[PDB]
Design an enzyme around this catalytic site. Structure first.
Site, PDB file in Angstrom:
ATOM      1  N   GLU A   1     -19.214  24.856  -5.209  1.00 54.13           N
ATOM      2  CA  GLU A   1     -19.292  24.934  -6.662  1.00 54.13           C
ATOM      3  C   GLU A   1     -18.274  23.936  -7.181  1.00 54.13           C
ATOM      4  O   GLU A   1     -18.574  22.750  -7.275  1.00 54.13           O
ATOM      5  CB  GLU A   1     -19.097  26.365  -7.148  1.00 54.13           C
ATOM      6  CG  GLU A   1     -20.265  27.244  -6.729  1.00 54.13           C
ATOM      7  CD  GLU A   1     -20.108  28.682  -7.144  1.00 54.13           C
ATOM      8  OE1 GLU A   1     -19.364  28.967  -8.111  1.00 54.13           O
ATOM      9  OE2 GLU A   1     -20.683  29.555  -6.471  1.00 54.13           O
TER      10      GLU A   1
ATOM     11  N   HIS B   1     -11.899  28.828  -3.183  1.00 56.66           N
ATOM     12  CA  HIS B   1     -13.167  28.540  -3.848  1.00 56.66           C
ATOM     13  C   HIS B   1     -12.850  27.876  -5.185  1.00 56.66           C
ATOM     14  O   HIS B   1     -11.691  27.817  -5.545  1.00 56.66           O
ATOM     15  CB  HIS B   1     -13.994  29.822  -4.025  1.00 56.66           C
ATOM     16  CG  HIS B   1     -15.443  29.556  -4.224  1.00 56.66           C
ATOM     17  ND1 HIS B   1     -16.191  30.093  -5.253  1.00 56.66           N
ATOM     18  CD2 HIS B   1     -16.267  28.782  -3.490  1.00 56.66           C
ATOM     19  CE1 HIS B   1     -17.431  29.633  -5.126  1.00 56.66           C
ATOM     20  NE2 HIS B   1     -17.501  28.845  -4.068  1.00 56.66           N
TER      21      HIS B   1
ATOM     22  N   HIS C   1      -1.978  35.358   4.543  1.00 58.01           N
ATOM     23  CA  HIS C   1      -3.117  36.263   4.676  1.00 58.01           C
ATOM     24  C   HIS C   1      -3.587  36.811   3.336  1.00 58.01           C
ATOM     25  O   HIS C   1      -2.806  37.330   2.542  1.00 58.01           O
ATOM     26  CB  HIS C   1      -2.764  37.485   5.520  1.00 58.01           C
ATOM     27  CG  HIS C   1      -2.395  37.165   6.932  1.00 58.01           C
ATOM     28  ND1 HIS C   1      -3.311  36.708   7.850  1.00 58.01           N
ATOM     29  CD2 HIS C   1      -1.210  37.235   7.585  1.00 58.01           C
ATOM     30  CE1 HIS C   1      -2.699  36.518   9.011  1.00 58.01           C
ATOM     31  NE2 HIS C   1      -1.424  36.838   8.882  1.00 58.01           N
TER      32      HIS C   1
ATOM     33  N   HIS D   1      -8.174  29.880  -6.243  1.00 63.00           N
ATOM     34  CA  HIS D   1      -9.427  29.638  -6.915  1.00 63.00           C
ATOM     35  C   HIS D   1      -9.271  28.531  -7.942  1.00 63.00           C
ATOM     36  O   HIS D   1      -8.498  28.650  -8.895  1.00 63.00           O
ATOM     37  CB  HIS D   1     -10.038  30.902  -7.548  1.00 63.00           C
ATOM     38  CG  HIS D   1     -11.522  30.806  -7.710  1.00 63.00           C
ATOM     39  ND1 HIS D   1     -12.138  30.009  -8.653  1.00 63.00           N
ATOM     40  CD2 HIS D   1     -12.524  31.374  -6.995  1.00 63.00           C
ATOM     41  CE1 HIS D   1     -13.453  30.093  -8.493  1.00 63.00           C
ATOM     42  NE2 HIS D   1     -13.720  30.915  -7.494  1.00 63.00           N
TER      43      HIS D   1
END
Ligand SMILES: [Cl-]
Ligand SMILES: [Cl-]
Ligand SMILES: [Cl-]
Ligand SMILES: [Cl-]
Ligand SMILES: [Zn+2]
Ligand SMILES: [Zn+2]
Ligand SMILES: [Zn+2]
Lengths: 166, 166, 166
Positions: B40, B59, B86, B91
Protein backbone atom coordinates in the site's frame (compact mmCIF):
# COMPACT_ATOMS: atom_id res chain seq x y z
CA UNK A 1 21.15 -25.15 18.38
CA UNK A 2 20.05 -27.97 20.66
CA UNK A 3 16.69 -29.56 19.77
CA UNK A 4 13.44 -29.11 21.65
CA UNK A 5 12.51 -31.80 24.16
CA UNK A 6 8.82 -32.43 23.54
CA UNK A 7 7.04 -34.70 26.01
CA UNK A 8 5.09 -37.54 24.37
CA UNK A 9 1.73 -36.12 25.49
CA UNK A 10 2.49 -32.50 24.53
CA UNK A 11 0.70 -31.00 21.54
CA UNK A 12 2.64 -28.57 19.35
CA UNK A 13 0.80 -27.27 16.32
CA UNK A 14 2.84 -27.60 13.13
CA UNK A 15 2.60 -23.83 12.53
CA UNK A 16 4.37 -23.04 15.83
CA UNK A 17 7.89 -21.72 15.25
CA UNK A 18 9.63 -23.78 17.93
CA UNK A 19 13.47 -23.65 17.90
CA UNK A 20 16.30 -24.60 20.27
CA UNK A 21 16.52 -25.96 23.79
CA UNK A 22 12.86 -25.67 24.75
CA UNK A 23 11.88 -28.30 27.32
CA UNK A 24 8.16 -28.97 27.05
CA UNK A 25 6.44 -31.09 29.67
CA UNK A 26 3.35 -33.33 29.77
CA UNK A 27 0.05 -32.29 28.22
CA UNK A 28 1.33 -28.88 27.08
CA UNK A 29 -0.78 -27.31 24.34
CA UNK A 30 1.01 -24.95 21.94
CA UNK A 31 -1.31 -23.28 19.47
CA UNK A 32 -0.68 -22.25 15.89
CA UNK A 33 0.58 -18.71 15.49
CA UNK A 34 3.13 -18.99 18.29
CA UNK A 35 6.85 -18.29 18.29
CA UNK A 36 8.98 -20.05 20.90
CA UNK A 37 12.64 -19.66 19.93
CA UNK A 38 15.55 -20.39 22.28
CA UNK A 39 18.03 -19.06 19.69
CA UNK A 40 19.41 -16.25 21.90
CA UNK A 41 18.48 -16.79 25.54
CA UNK A 42 18.38 -20.52 26.27
CA UNK A 43 17.11 -22.89 27.70
CA UNK A 44 13.36 -22.55 28.10
CA UNK A 45 11.01 -24.69 30.24
CA UNK A 46 7.25 -24.99 29.75
CA UNK A 47 5.59 -26.98 32.52
CA UNK A 48 2.88 -29.59 32.40
CA UNK A 49 -0.62 -28.71 31.22
CA UNK A 50 0.47 -25.20 30.22
CA UNK A 51 -1.28 -23.58 27.25
CA UNK A 52 0.48 -21.17 24.89
CA UNK A 53 -2.14 -19.40 22.76
CA UNK A 54 -2.15 -18.02 19.22
CA UNK A 55 -0.19 -14.77 18.87
CA UNK A 56 2.25 -15.38 21.72
CA UNK A 57 5.96 -14.75 21.43
CA UNK A 58 8.39 -16.35 23.89
CA UNK A 59 11.99 -15.19 23.41
CA UNK A 60 14.99 -14.42 25.63
CA UNK A 61 18.03 -12.18 25.94
CA UNK A 62 21.38 -13.84 25.32
CA UNK A 63 22.44 -12.71 28.80
CA UNK A 64 20.34 -13.06 31.93
CA UNK A 65 18.85 -16.14 33.56
CA UNK A 66 16.41 -17.22 36.24
CA UNK A 67 16.64 -20.28 38.45
CA UNK A 68 14.18 -23.01 37.56
CA UNK A 69 12.55 -25.41 40.02
CA UNK A 70 15.29 -27.93 39.14
CA UNK A 71 18.02 -25.46 40.15
CA UNK A 72 19.19 -25.00 36.56
CA UNK A 73 19.46 -21.65 34.80
CA UNK A 74 16.79 -20.78 32.24
CA UNK A 75 16.18 -17.81 30.03
CA UNK A 76 12.44 -18.49 30.39
CA UNK A 77 10.78 -20.74 32.98
CA UNK A 78 7.01 -21.17 32.73
CA UNK A 79 5.55 -23.50 35.33
CA UNK A 80 2.78 -26.07 35.37
CA UNK A 81 -0.89 -25.22 34.71
CA UNK A 82 -0.10 -21.79 33.29
CA UNK A 83 -2.15 -19.98 30.65
CA UNK A 84 -0.10 -17.73 28.36
CA UNK A 85 -2.98 -16.19 26.45
CA UNK A 86 -3.26 -14.51 23.06
CA UNK A 87 -0.53 -12.05 22.10
CA UNK A 88 1.31 -12.29 25.39
CA UNK A 89 5.04 -11.62 25.24
CA UNK A 90 7.18 -13.63 27.66
CA UNK A 91 10.72 -12.40 27.30
CA UNK A 92 13.64 -13.85 29.18
CA UNK A 93 14.93 -13.47 31.72
CA UNK A 94 11.52 -14.47 33.09
CA UNK A 95 10.02 -16.87 35.62
CA UNK A 96 6.28 -17.51 35.75
CA UNK A 97 5.15 -19.77 38.54
CA UNK A 98 2.67 -22.62 38.56
CA UNK A 99 -0.98 -21.84 37.99
CA UNK A 100 -0.56 -18.29 36.69
CA UNK A 101 -2.96 -16.70 34.23
CA UNK A 102 -1.30 -14.19 31.87
CA UNK A 103 -4.08 -12.33 30.08
CA UNK A 104 -4.35 -11.08 26.55
CA UNK A 105 -1.61 -8.86 25.20
CA UNK A 106 0.34 -8.82 28.46
CA UNK A 107 4.12 -8.77 28.76
CA UNK A 108 6.49 -10.28 31.32
CA UNK A 109 10.14 -9.26 30.82
CA UNK A 110 13.09 -9.37 33.22
CA UNK A 111 10.70 -10.38 36.00
CA UNK A 112 9.48 -13.13 38.29
CA UNK A 113 5.76 -13.77 38.70
CA UNK A 114 4.95 -15.98 41.66
CA UNK A 115 2.72 -19.01 41.55
CA UNK A 116 -1.01 -18.43 41.36
CA UNK A 117 -1.00 -14.85 40.06
CA UNK A 118 -3.82 -13.61 37.85
CA UNK A 119 -2.46 -11.04 35.42
CA UNK A 120 -5.19 -9.44 33.34
CA UNK A 121 -5.18 -7.85 29.87
CA UNK A 122 -2.86 -5.24 28.35
CA UNK A 123 -0.48 -5.41 31.35
CA UNK A 124 3.27 -4.76 31.38
CA UNK A 125 5.36 -6.45 34.08
CA UNK A 126 9.04 -5.54 33.84
CA UNK A 127 12.05 -5.43 36.17
CA UNK A 128 10.15 -6.67 39.24
CA UNK A 129 9.21 -9.67 41.35
CA UNK A 130 5.46 -10.19 41.80
CA UNK A 131 4.77 -12.26 44.95
CA UNK A 132 2.65 -15.41 44.67
CA UNK A 133 -1.11 -15.04 44.59
CA UNK A 134 -1.38 -11.45 43.36
CA UNK A 135 -3.89 -9.90 40.94
CA UNK A 136 -2.85 -7.36 38.31
CA UNK A 137 -5.77 -5.38 36.84
CA UNK A 138 -6.01 -4.72 33.12
CA UNK A 139 -3.89 -1.92 31.69
CA UNK A 140 -1.42 -1.72 34.60
CA UNK A 141 2.18 -0.86 33.80
CA UNK A 142 4.34 -2.35 36.55
CA UNK A 143 8.00 -1.29 36.20
CA UNK A 144 9.08 -0.72 39.80
CA UNK A 145 9.18 -2.97 42.83
CA UNK A 146 7.21 -0.37 44.82
CA UNK A 147 4.26 -0.88 42.43
CA UNK A 148 4.60 -4.66 42.54
CA UNK A 149 4.54 -4.55 46.35
CA UNK A 150 1.16 -2.72 46.34
CA UNK A 151 -0.72 -5.31 44.25
CA UNK A 152 -3.91 -6.85 45.68
CA UNK A 153 -4.32 -10.55 46.45
CA UNK A 154 -6.21 -12.81 44.08
CA UNK A 155 -9.86 -13.14 45.10
CA UNK A 156 -12.29 -15.93 44.37
CA UNK A 157 -13.81 -13.94 41.47
CA UNK A 158 -10.35 -13.54 39.87
CA UNK A 159 -9.79 -17.31 40.07
CA UNK A 160 -13.29 -17.86 38.66
CA UNK A 161 -12.59 -15.44 35.80
CA UNK A 162 -9.32 -17.15 34.84
CA UNK A 163 -10.86 -20.64 34.96
CA UNK A 164 -13.73 -19.40 32.79
CA UNK A 165 -11.35 -18.03 30.14
CA UNK A 166 -9.10 -21.08 29.98
CA UNK B 1 4.86 -4.53 -7.10
CA UNK B 2 8.53 -3.60 -7.31
CA UNK B 3 10.93 -6.10 -5.69
CA UNK B 4 12.79 -5.62 -2.43
CA UNK B 5 16.37 -4.39 -2.66
CA UNK B 6 18.26 -6.55 -0.18
CA UNK B 7 21.88 -5.60 0.51
CA UNK B 8 24.34 -8.49 0.14
CA UNK B 9 25.16 -8.50 3.87
CA UNK B 10 21.55 -8.19 5.07
CA UNK B 11 19.92 -11.21 6.71
CA UNK B 12 16.23 -11.81 6.05
CA UNK B 13 14.78 -14.92 7.62
CA UNK B 14 12.82 -17.02 5.12
CA UNK B 15 9.68 -16.76 7.30
CA UNK B 16 9.62 -12.94 7.01
CA UNK B 17 6.75 -11.76 4.80
CA UNK B 18 8.72 -9.18 2.82
CA UNK B 19 6.89 -7.65 -0.20
CA UNK B 20 7.36 -4.65 -2.50
CA UNK B 21 9.79 -1.76 -2.70
CA UNK B 22 11.58 -2.29 0.61
CA UNK B 23 15.16 -1.01 0.47
CA UNK B 24 17.24 -2.88 3.02
CA UNK B 25 20.78 -1.74 3.77
CA UNK B 26 23.97 -3.40 5.02
CA UNK B 27 23.98 -5.84 7.92
CA UNK B 28 20.23 -5.54 8.56
CA UNK B 29 18.80 -8.44 10.55
CA UNK B 30 15.14 -9.30 9.92
CA UNK B 31 13.83 -12.03 12.20
CA UNK B 32 11.26 -14.71 11.51
CA UNK B 33 7.72 -13.73 12.40
CA UNK B 34 7.95 -10.31 10.78
CA UNK B 35 5.74 -8.66 8.19
CA UNK B 36 7.26 -5.91 6.04
CA UNK B 37 4.92 -5.24 3.12
CA UNK B 38 5.17 -2.17 0.87
CA UNK B 39 1.95 -3.17 -0.92
CA UNK B 40 0.00 0.00 0.00
CA UNK B 41 2.33 2.73 1.21
CA UNK B 42 5.64 2.46 -0.63
CA UNK B 43 8.68 2.67 -0.63
CA UNK B 44 10.25 1.62 2.65
CA UNK B 45 13.87 2.09 3.79
CA UNK B 46 15.59 0.09 6.53
CA UNK B 47 19.05 1.42 7.34
CA UNK B 48 22.28 -0.37 8.04
CA UNK B 49 22.66 -2.60 11.09
CA UNK B 50 18.97 -2.22 11.96
CA UNK B 51 17.25 -5.17 13.65
CA UNK B 52 13.57 -6.01 13.08
CA UNK B 53 12.46 -8.52 15.72
CA UNK B 54 9.92 -11.34 15.76
CA UNK B 55 6.31 -10.11 15.92
CA UNK B 56 6.88 -6.75 14.23
CA UNK B 57 4.60 -5.40 11.54
CA UNK B 58 5.80 -2.63 9.21
CA UNK B 59 3.08 -1.36 6.86
CA UNK B 60 2.04 1.99 5.36
CA UNK B 61 -0.97 3.99 4.23
CA UNK B 62 -1.39 4.38 0.49
CA UNK B 63 -1.35 8.15 1.00
CA UNK B 64 1.16 10.02 3.15
CA UNK B 65 4.93 10.15 2.97
CA UNK B 66 7.99 11.30 4.89
CA UNK B 67 11.22 12.64 3.46
CA UNK B 68 14.13 10.23 3.72
CA UNK B 69 17.77 11.21 4.21
CA UNK B 70 18.20 10.91 0.42
CA UNK B 71 15.42 13.48 -0.18
CA UNK B 72 13.07 10.86 -1.61
CA UNK B 73 9.56 10.19 -0.34
CA UNK B 74 9.00 7.07 1.75
CA UNK B 75 6.01 5.57 3.43
CA UNK B 76 8.37 4.25 6.14
CA UNK B 77 11.96 5.35 6.76
CA UNK B 78 13.87 3.54 9.49
CA UNK B 79 17.45 4.72 9.91
CA UNK B 80 20.74 3.05 10.71
CA UNK B 81 21.44 1.21 13.99
CA UNK B 82 17.77 1.07 14.97
CA UNK B 83 16.16 -1.66 17.07
CA UNK B 84 12.52 -2.35 16.20
CA UNK B 85 11.79 -4.82 18.97
CA UNK B 86 9.19 -7.55 19.42
CA UNK B 87 5.62 -6.73 18.40
CA UNK B 88 6.34 -3.15 17.48
CA UNK B 89 4.09 -1.65 14.82
CA UNK B 90 5.73 0.88 12.49
CA UNK B 91 3.01 2.25 10.26
CA UNK B 92 3.64 4.74 7.50
CA UNK B 93 3.80 7.59 7.22
CA UNK B 94 6.69 7.22 9.68
CA UNK B 95 10.30 8.31 10.08
CA UNK B 96 12.53 6.79 12.75
CA UNK B 97 15.98 8.29 12.99
CA UNK B 98 19.36 6.65 13.39
CA UNK B 99 20.13 4.88 16.63
CA UNK B 100 16.59 4.73 18.01
CA UNK B 101 15.38 1.97 20.30
CA UNK B 102 11.68 1.13 19.88
CA UNK B 103 10.70 -1.13 22.77
CA UNK B 104 8.38 -4.07 22.94
CA UNK B 105 4.84 -3.66 21.69
CA UNK B 106 5.27 0.01 20.83
CA UNK B 107 3.67 1.79 17.89
CA UNK B 108 4.87 4.65 15.69
CA UNK B 109 2.23 5.89 13.23
CA UNK B 110 1.99 9.16 11.30
CA UNK B 111 4.98 10.44 13.24
CA UNK B 112 8.66 11.35 13.16
CA UNK B 113 10.99 10.08 15.88
CA UNK B 114 14.32 11.87 15.92
CA UNK B 115 17.69 10.18 15.99
CA UNK B 116 18.81 8.66 19.27
CA UNK B 117 15.42 8.36 20.99
CA UNK B 118 14.79 5.57 23.48
CA UNK B 119 11.14 4.55 23.31
CA UNK B 120 10.24 2.01 25.96
CA UNK B 121 7.54 -0.69 26.11
CA UNK B 122 3.81 -0.51 25.38
CA UNK B 123 4.11 3.06 24.01
CA UNK B 124 1.94 4.72 21.37
CA UNK B 125 3.46 7.55 19.31
CA UNK B 126 0.99 9.01 16.81
CA UNK B 127 0.52 12.29 14.95
CA UNK B 128 3.62 13.97 16.43
CA UNK B 129 7.28 14.77 15.96
CA UNK B 130 9.55 13.55 18.77
CA UNK B 131 12.80 15.59 18.83
CA UNK B 132 16.13 13.76 18.71
CA UNK B 133 17.48 12.29 21.92
CA UNK B 134 14.24 11.94 23.89
CA UNK B 135 13.14 9.16 26.26
CA UNK B 136 9.57 7.83 26.29
CA UNK B 137 8.70 5.84 29.42
CA UNK B 138 6.75 2.60 29.20
CA UNK B 139 2.99 2.83 28.76
CA UNK B 140 2.92 6.43 27.51
CA UNK B 141 0.31 7.35 24.92
CA UNK B 142 1.66 10.30 22.94
CA UNK B 143 -0.96 11.69 20.51
CA UNK B 144 -0.42 15.45 20.73
CA UNK B 145 2.57 17.64 20.03
CA UNK B 146 2.19 19.25 23.48
CA UNK B 147 2.94 15.84 25.06
CA UNK B 148 5.84 15.18 22.70
CA UNK B 149 7.34 18.56 23.61
CA UNK B 150 7.38 17.64 27.34
CA UNK B 151 9.43 14.43 26.96
CA UNK B 152 12.66 14.07 28.97
CA UNK B 153 16.10 13.72 27.39
CA UNK B 154 17.77 10.34 27.16
CA UNK B 155 20.07 9.72 30.11
CA UNK B 156 23.08 7.45 30.36
CA UNK B 157 20.99 4.75 32.07
CA UNK B 158 18.47 4.79 29.18
CA UNK B 159 21.30 4.30 26.67
CA UNK B 160 22.72 1.53 28.88
CA UNK B 161 19.31 -0.15 29.06
CA UNK B 162 18.82 -0.11 25.28
CA UNK B 163 22.34 -1.44 24.60
CA UNK B 164 21.74 -4.21 27.14
CA UNK B 165 18.50 -5.29 25.44
CA UNK B 166 19.86 -5.26 21.89
CA UNK C 1 -14.73 -28.74 12.13
CA UNK C 2 -17.19 -27.26 9.65
CA UNK C 3 -15.61 -25.47 6.67
CA UNK C 4 -15.49 -21.72 6.13
CA UNK C 5 -18.16 -20.21 3.89
CA UNK C 6 -16.27 -17.77 1.70
CA UNK C 7 -18.35 -15.51 -0.53
CA UNK C 8 -17.30 -15.54 -4.20
CA UNK C 9 -16.13 -11.90 -4.08
CA UNK C 10 -14.27 -12.19 -0.76
CA UNK C 11 -10.47 -12.09 -0.79
CA UNK C 12 -8.62 -14.28 1.70
CA UNK C 13 -4.85 -14.20 1.46
CA UNK C 14 -3.33 -17.69 1.33
CA UNK C 15 -1.25 -16.94 4.45
CA UNK C 16 -4.37 -16.32 6.58
CA UNK C 17 -4.95 -19.14 9.07
CA UNK C 18 -8.69 -19.51 8.52
CA UNK C 19 -10.33 -22.55 10.21
CA UNK C 20 -13.87 -23.71 11.02
CA UNK C 21 -17.33 -22.24 10.64
CA UNK C 22 -16.35 -18.72 9.60
CA UNK C 23 -19.03 -17.12 7.41
CA UNK C 24 -17.42 -14.47 5.23
CA UNK C 25 -19.60 -12.13 3.19
CA UNK C 26 -19.19 -10.15 -0.04
CA UNK C 27 -16.06 -8.15 -0.80
CA UNK C 28 -14.36 -9.00 2.51
CA UNK C 29 -10.60 -8.48 2.47
CA UNK C 30 -8.54 -10.69 4.79
CA UNK C 31 -4.85 -9.83 4.80
CA UNK C 32 -1.86 -12.08 5.22
CA UNK C 33 -0.69 -12.47 8.80
CA UNK C 34 -4.18 -13.01 10.18
CA UNK C 35 -5.58 -15.80 12.33
CA UNK C 36 -9.31 -16.46 12.19
CA UNK C 37 -10.01 -19.82 13.83
CA UNK C 38 -13.48 -21.00 14.87
CA UNK C 39 -11.98 -24.10 16.52
CA UNK C 40 -13.26 -23.30 20.04
CA UNK C 41 -15.98 -20.66 19.95
CA UNK C 42 -18.00 -21.05 16.76
CA UNK C 43 -19.52 -19.80 14.43
CA UNK C 44 -18.03 -16.51 13.28
CA UNK C 45 -19.55 -13.95 10.87
CA UNK C 46 -17.60 -11.31 8.95
CA UNK C 47 -19.87 -8.91 7.09
CA UNK C 48 -19.60 -7.43 3.64
CA UNK C 49 -16.75 -5.10 2.74
CA UNK C 50 -15.04 -5.69 6.10
CA UNK C 51 -11.23 -5.57 6.19
CA UNK C 52 -9.17 -7.73 8.54
CA UNK C 53 -5.59 -6.42 8.60
CA UNK C 54 -2.20 -8.06 9.07
CA UNK C 55 -1.50 -9.05 12.69
CA UNK C 56 -5.12 -9.54 13.75
CA UNK C 57 -6.29 -12.51 15.76
CA UNK C 58 -9.98 -13.45 15.86
CA UNK C 59 -10.74 -16.31 18.26
CA UNK C 60 -13.56 -17.27 20.65
CA UNK C 61 -14.27 -18.99 23.94
CA UNK C 62 -15.92 -22.40 23.71
CA UNK C 63 -18.74 -21.03 25.88
CA UNK C 64 -20.46 -17.70 25.37
CA UNK C 65 -22.32 -16.32 22.37
CA UNK C 66 -23.81 -13.14 20.97
CA UNK C 67 -26.91 -12.82 18.81
CA UNK C 68 -26.18 -11.99 15.19
CA UNK C 69 -28.37 -9.88 12.92
CA UNK C 70 -29.88 -13.15 11.61
CA UNK C 71 -30.94 -14.18 15.15
CA UNK C 72 -28.39 -17.00 15.28
CA UNK C 73 -25.77 -17.42 17.99
CA UNK C 74 -22.19 -16.52 17.13
CA UNK C 75 -18.96 -16.57 19.05
CA UNK C 76 -17.86 -13.54 16.98
CA UNK C 77 -20.08 -11.31 14.85
CA UNK C 78 -18.37 -8.55 12.88
CA UNK C 79 -20.73 -6.49 10.76
CA UNK C 80 -20.54 -4.86 7.35
CA UNK C 81 -18.05 -2.11 6.46
CA UNK C 82 -15.90 -2.72 9.53
CA UNK C 83 -12.15 -2.14 9.74
CA UNK C 84 -10.33 -4.52 12.09
CA UNK C 85 -6.90 -2.94 11.88
CA UNK C 86 -3.39 -4.21 12.54
CA UNK C 87 -2.87 -6.33 15.65
CA UNK C 88 -6.42 -6.02 16.87
CA UNK C 89 -7.70 -8.92 18.96
CA UNK C 90 -11.40 -9.74 18.57
CA UNK C 91 -12.19 -12.47 21.04
CA UNK C 92 -15.58 -14.09 21.34
CA UNK C 93 -18.04 -13.61 22.75
CA UNK C 94 -18.02 -10.36 20.74
CA UNK C 95 -20.33 -8.32 18.53
CA UNK C 96 -19.02 -5.43 16.46
CA UNK C 97 -21.65 -3.50 14.57
CA UNK C 98 -21.69 -2.18 11.04
CA UNK C 99 -19.30 0.58 10.11
CA UNK C 100 -17.04 0.36 13.16
CA UNK C 101 -13.36 1.27 13.07
CA UNK C 102 -11.22 -0.77 15.48
CA UNK C 103 -7.80 0.88 15.62
CA UNK C 104 -4.36 -0.58 15.87
CA UNK C 105 -3.61 -2.99 18.68
CA UNK C 106 -7.08 -2.72 20.20
CA UNK C 107 -8.99 -5.55 21.86
CA UNK C 108 -12.70 -6.36 22.03
CA UNK C 109 -13.52 -9.30 24.33
CA UNK C 110 -16.81 -10.33 25.94
CA UNK C 111 -18.37 -7.13 24.65
CA UNK C 112 -20.76 -5.52 22.19
CA UNK C 113 -19.67 -2.48 20.19
CA UNK C 114 -22.57 -0.71 18.52
CA UNK C 115 -22.69 0.29 14.89
CA UNK C 116 -20.64 3.29 13.83
CA UNK C 117 -18.19 3.40 16.74
CA UNK C 118 -14.66 4.71 16.22
CA UNK C 119 -12.30 2.87 18.54
CA UNK C 120 -8.78 4.26 18.41
CA UNK C 121 -5.37 2.69 19.10
CA UNK C 122 -4.15 0.61 22.04
CA UNK C 123 -7.68 0.35 23.50
CA UNK C 124 -9.12 -2.47 25.62
CA UNK C 125 -12.89 -3.02 25.54
CA UNK C 126 -13.98 -5.87 27.81
CA UNK C 127 -17.15 -6.94 29.63
CA UNK C 128 -19.26 -4.00 28.40
CA UNK C 129 -21.72 -2.78 25.80
CA UNK C 130 -20.61 0.33 23.89
CA UNK C 131 -23.65 2.14 22.43
CA UNK C 132 -23.74 2.93 18.71
CA UNK C 133 -21.84 5.97 17.48
CA UNK C 134 -19.32 6.34 20.30
CA UNK C 135 -15.65 7.36 20.13
CA UNK C 136 -12.98 5.66 22.26
CA UNK C 137 -9.72 7.63 22.51
CA UNK C 138 -6.37 5.90 22.22
CA UNK C 139 -5.05 4.07 25.28
CA UNK C 140 -8.41 3.78 27.07
CA UNK C 141 -9.03 0.66 29.14
CA UNK C 142 -12.79 0.13 29.28
CA UNK C 143 -13.72 -2.73 31.65
CA UNK C 144 -16.87 -1.43 33.36
CA UNK C 145 -20.24 -0.36 32.04
CA UNK C 146 -19.93 2.93 33.96
CA UNK C 147 -16.90 3.82 31.80
CA UNK C 148 -18.64 2.72 28.60
CA UNK C 149 -21.63 4.93 29.48
CA UNK C 150 -19.38 8.04 29.71
CA UNK C 151 -17.89 7.76 26.20
CA UNK C 152 -18.23 10.74 23.83
CA UNK C 153 -20.13 10.61 20.54
CA UNK C 154 -18.28 10.27 17.26
CA UNK C 155 -17.60 13.66 15.69
CA UNK C 156 -17.03 14.54 12.06
CA UNK C 157 -13.25 14.59 12.59
CA UNK C 158 -13.35 11.04 14.03
CA UNK C 159 -15.24 9.82 10.95
CA UNK C 160 -12.77 11.69 8.73
CA UNK C 161 -9.84 10.11 10.57
CA UNK C 162 -11.20 6.56 10.19
CA UNK C 163 -11.99 7.04 6.49
CA UNK C 164 -8.48 8.41 5.95
CA UNK C 165 -6.87 5.36 7.59
CA UNK C 166 -8.95 2.75 5.77
CL1 LIG D 1 -5.21 -20.33 20.87
CL1 LIG E 1 0.30 -6.73 20.33
CL1 LIG F 1 13.80 -11.63 17.27
CL1 LIG G 1 -3.08 -5.24 6.11
ZN1 LIG H 1 14.10 -11.01 21.85
ZN1 LIG I 1 -1.83 -0.91 7.18
ZN1 LIG J 1 -8.78 -17.87 22.51
Amino acid sequence: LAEPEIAPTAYVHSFSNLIGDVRIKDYVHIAPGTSIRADEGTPFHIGSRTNIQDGVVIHGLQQGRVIGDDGQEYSVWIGDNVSITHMALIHGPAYIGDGCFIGFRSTVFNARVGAGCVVMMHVLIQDVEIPPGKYVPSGMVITTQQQADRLPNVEESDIHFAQHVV
